[PDB]
Design a protein around this ligand. Sequence first.
Ligand SMILES: Nc1ncnc2c1ncn2[C@@H]1O[C@H](COP(=O)(O)CP(=O)(O)OP(=O)(O)O)[C@@H](O)[C@H]1O
Ligand SMILES: Nc1ncnc2c1ncn2[C@@H]1O[C@H](COP(=O)(O)CP(=O)(O)OP(=O)(O)O)[C@@H](O)[C@H]1O
Ligand SMILES: Nc1ncnc2c1ncn2[C@@H]1O[C@H](COP(=O)(O)CP(=O)(O)OP(=O)(O)O)[C@@H](O)[C@H]1O
Ligand SMILES: Nc1ncnc2c1ncn2[C@@H]1O[C@H](COP(=O)(O)CP(=O)(O)OP(=O)(O)O)[C@@H](O)[C@H]1O
Ligand SMILES: Nc1ncnc2c1ncn2[C@@H]1O[C@H](COP(=O)(O)CP(=O)(O)OP(=O)(O)O)[C@@H](O)[C@H]1O
Ligand SMILES: Nc1ncnc2c1ncn2[C@@H]1O[C@H](COP(=O)(O)CP(=O)(O)OP(=O)(O)O)[C@@H](O)[C@H]1O
Ligand SMILES: [Mg+2]
Ligand SMILES: [Mg+2]
Ligand SMILES: [Mg+2]
Ligand SMILES: [Mg+2]
Ligand SMILES: [Mg+2]
Ligand SMILES: [Mg+2]
Lengths: 156, 156, 156, 156, 156, 156
Amino acid sequence: MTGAVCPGSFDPVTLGHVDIFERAAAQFDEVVVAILVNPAKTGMFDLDERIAMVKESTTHLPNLRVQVGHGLVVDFVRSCGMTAIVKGLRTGTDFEYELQMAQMNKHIAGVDTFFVATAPRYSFVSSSLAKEVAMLGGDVSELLPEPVNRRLRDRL
Amino acid sequence: MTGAVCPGSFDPVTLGHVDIFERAAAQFDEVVVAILVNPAKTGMFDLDERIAMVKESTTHLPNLRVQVGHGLVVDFVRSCGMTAIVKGLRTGTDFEYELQMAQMNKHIAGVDTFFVATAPRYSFVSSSLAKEVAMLGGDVSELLPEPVNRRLRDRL
Amino acid sequence: MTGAVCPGSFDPVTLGHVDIFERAAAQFDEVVVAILVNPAKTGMFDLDERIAMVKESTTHLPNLRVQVGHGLVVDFVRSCGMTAIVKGLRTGTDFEYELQMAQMNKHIAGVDTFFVATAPRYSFVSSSLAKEVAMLGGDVSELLPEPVNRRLRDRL
Amino acid sequence: MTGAVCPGSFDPVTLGHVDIFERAAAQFDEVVVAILVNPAKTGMFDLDERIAMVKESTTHLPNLRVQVGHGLVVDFVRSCGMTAIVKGLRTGTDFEYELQMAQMNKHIAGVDTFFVATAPRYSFVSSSLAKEVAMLGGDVSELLPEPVNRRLRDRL
Amino acid sequence: MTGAVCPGSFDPVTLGHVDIFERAAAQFDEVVVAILVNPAKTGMFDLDERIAMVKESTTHLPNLRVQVGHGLVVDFVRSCGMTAIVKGLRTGTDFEYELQMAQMNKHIAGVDTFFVATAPRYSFVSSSLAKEVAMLGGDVSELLPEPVNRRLRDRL
Amino acid sequence: MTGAVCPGSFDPVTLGHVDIFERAAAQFDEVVVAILVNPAKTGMFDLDERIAMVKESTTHLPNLRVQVGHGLVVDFVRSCGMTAIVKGLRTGTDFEYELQMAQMNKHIAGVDTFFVATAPRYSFVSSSLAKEVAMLGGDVSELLPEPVNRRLRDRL
Ligand SMILES: Nc1ncnc2c1ncn2[C@@H]1O[C@H](COP(=O)(O)CP(=O)(O)OP(=O)(O)O)[C@@H](O)[C@H]1O
Ligand SMILES: Nc1ncnc2c1ncn2[C@@H]1O[C@H](COP(=O)(O)CP(=O)(O)OP(=O)(O)O)[C@@H](O)[C@H]1O
Ligand SMILES: Nc1ncnc2c1ncn2[C@@H]1O[C@H](COP(=O)(O)CP(=O)(O)OP(=O)(O)O)[C@@H](O)[C@H]1O
Ligand SMILES: Nc1ncnc2c1ncn2[C@@H]1O[C@H](COP(=O)(O)CP(=O)(O)OP(=O)(O)O)[C@@H](O)[C@H]1O
Ligand SMILES: Nc1ncnc2c1ncn2[C@@H]1O[C@H](COP(=O)(O)CP(=O)(O)OP(=O)(O)O)[C@@H](O)[C@H]1O
Ligand SMILES: Nc1ncnc2c1ncn2[C@@H]1O[C@H](COP(=O)(O)CP(=O)(O)OP(=O)(O)O)[C@@H](O)[C@H]1O
Ligand SMILES: [Mg+2]
Ligand SMILES: [Mg+2]
Ligand SMILES: [Mg+2]
Ligand SMILES: [Mg+2]
Ligand SMILES: [Mg+2]
Ligand SMILES: [Mg+2]
């Protein structure tokens, strides 16, 4: 059984993430969305809200499951009995930076990384930027799934 | 039932190629190496020399098959009953070019593309560069597989 | 009295082009689309087919005019009584190439260049890529304007 | 009446900024230099000194005015009755990064962004780097307008 | 007598650094590894351990010496009676960023900078990334000289 | 006994070139400018015109010599009793291309490459671009040295 882990902070999940989830889900037997803890960076939502927002936006994906990660991505991936990561890429800069982590991840663990190009529509969409805009009152509603919008309309 | 295509000219196959082959064969049920026809320009090796070279270097990959394509990659992909292309990336610049190709392929045919970062040790290997060096007497034997080295000796 | 020129081959105009046109026409009193002659190589469409295509897609832009240029863009620009070029950019790589052109144009003629980021939805559209796909039977109709789609049908 | 807002922190303004100011001022009816507040990042000068340094360096630009911005750039721009931003770009990396903000800024507000390539002379000039060098005793005097130099010769 | 300074934090030195050291040492009369103090960023090792780790890994390099730097790299270089810096580059992004510092360093001090491309083997190797992996239990032993490994096997 | 080679076509030499020459001549005991033969394509200037141009612009560089190379640069380099190539870099993109070349040269011949960032003032100068502009009547005289300007006048 083929499989890939999609790691990230998903704080919050965006239509950009959901496109990746779908695209990954179309090509692997299982996909595991791994929500990584950052103990240094406090963020807008906590895990329960995070998982919940991913679960609500991915109901149409049976082979996909959501799960909290800790420690080294590669350790998490291997603990899923998988050997592959799937990440989106918006630009060549992202690639130059993801490249190093991917080559490190192969070196230490035999875990490979597959990259998908962002969808043209959402290429400018990122969690941090959507937050800041939303904080300052801008309408980011067309860039996020409704589960996320409802919860934002609660943090007004 | 999971499957990816690796399109390219493989004129000739390199260790870089073989690496992508292995890496895709490990994650998909089926891999199809697609040797693509270009009219301008004609290669150094002929279509059958290329299939032979690809077959000869992939004997350890039982889920891997080699076919020859004409026309759009997506037409070729759709015709294998597959919806997914796999390619290696050397640099951020490669990515920016392939990103345009990838999105255009997805738009016209729902065919997605998965990218895989070069292995550190072959990041400089490309077939055009290896050929240029071999024509002028440089030893590229450690960058190509034995089947290829063989065919190259008989052009000294 | 504020004016910019959009130089290019527009062989043929795409929705990407039209987007830049609109975006420049909104910010300058006058926009001049400059169809530039290249000897090597000859296009797919002929000079008058290109003007027709540009006129036909810009009927909603009253401050926009189309002229044909030969030679250096800066000579053409200076001759419209203008000091400013406007171009779209797809990627960081586009920028690095155009940056050299821009600075060289400013040095030799005091002509400046204003760059405008591609619209997300057309970031993959270029005329050469659209042509390549159309020659091989892919549907690019959603990336080009109706006047162009029309002329393309009559080459199937 | 055409117009563009030049936003930044201008702490302090550099000959790099002044070139942009001039170049923008040559193509729009009005230009508004917007000095953005960062409540997180304390910096070398405060607003009054900032505005003053810009005002002293831009006396030769009648259509230009200087003004403090708050909140979302796009909200500021719209409050000036304008629909355009003008930013300098030094490299393809800057572009990849400015691209996302620009596409976001169009999405949420219809505000467009125009980019100008830095002048070859000042391509390495940036406020933060000039500060650090000046802090550590290096002579950055040829990279900053005299209004800024005099004030630095006061912070020795 | 020709010479170049190799500045960095070397916390800790990697096989990536050692390749650079060697390559620099092969082309200049002397090389001075300059270990720069960052008073803001606390790091894993302190200077004595840092110098010691470099000294133990560079015994085979007679023309090379190790030394603590303070203040402006260019001031340090000039204090060695040298006029050149040598740095490794992994990617085009690094280059775009090192370019600005190098052009600044020429401007203020006539100090030039030479760049060497990383070795394919170690292209993904960096001190910070090796630390994090090692912190989290990954085996980075093949990416660091034995002097560094022994000391890491002490911080378990 | 320290030495570097500067390979290139120098068709013709520019101020950019001369800058690299000076910068290398300041740091190595010997510099060899290597004018490399290309069959496709033939230049604007002939091999002896190029040597003359390089000699005429480097009279102030006593440790600099000009030879003509055929074949691989590394063969030419090894034959000067040298192990080092020196090249200028304009952009991150230049770097990514030259990085492949550099690593391939090191692999096949132990020949290393040192890169030097363009001087700000000539960052846009390349010989192909200067030629294109001169053919169409633009004044490139401030970007090339007098010996070259001379030979160009006699092609107006
Ligand atoms: N809009 C988008 N399109 C395609 N892939 C995206 C994407 N946004 C994010 N991704 C991918 O999915 C991964 C998980 O995202 P996160 O790390 O949770 C935050 P982000 O949205 O990437 O941007 P941020 O790190 O600037 O907040 C990212 O590393 C990226 O590879
Ligand atoms: N050393 C390497 N490492 C990883 N991927 C590589 C690689 N070399 C090539 N690839 C990928 O595999 C695909 C097939 O390659 P081809 O189109 O047959 C020729 P090439 O070897 O890429 O070099 P060239 O196109 O510069 O001659 C390419 O699209 C490329 O992305
Ligand atoms: N989809 C798009 N979005 C934004 N700008 C674009 C664009 N496509 C083209 N442009 C810009 O408009 C200018 C005119 O384009 P042309 O030179 O006529 C051909 P092209 O459509 O860029 O593709 P090609 O040159 O790869 O065939 C280009 O310099 C480019 O920067
Ligand atoms: N030297 C230069 N040449 C051209 N444009 C420049 C420039 N320096 C800055 N700019 C542009 O003007 C904007 C305003 O500058 P600021 O944000 O005040 C600081 P900065 O000088 O850009 O560099 P920094 O952010 O590293 O301090 C920048 O975002 C950049 O787009
Ligand atoms: N693996 C590698 N290959 C080639 N050059 C490298 C290299 N790692 C580092 N260098 C070069 O040597 C310099 C000194 O390194 P340091 O600043 O001590 C930490 P680093 O290993 O570069 O990565 P970091 O800054 O992400 O921790 C770097 O600026 C880089 O130019
Ligand atoms: N303005 C400049 N500043 C710094 N380095 C430069 C430079 N112009 C060229 N160089 C470097 O010197 C080397 C020799 O150049 P050549 O191959 O002779 C032609 P070119 O002048 O680079 O432009 P072209 O190749 O685009 O026509 C190049 O490899 C390039 O890296
Ligand atoms: Mg993130
Ligand atoms: Mg190819
Ligand atoms: Mg074109
Ligand atoms: Mg800033
Ligand atoms: Mg560092
Ligand atoms: Mg050249």
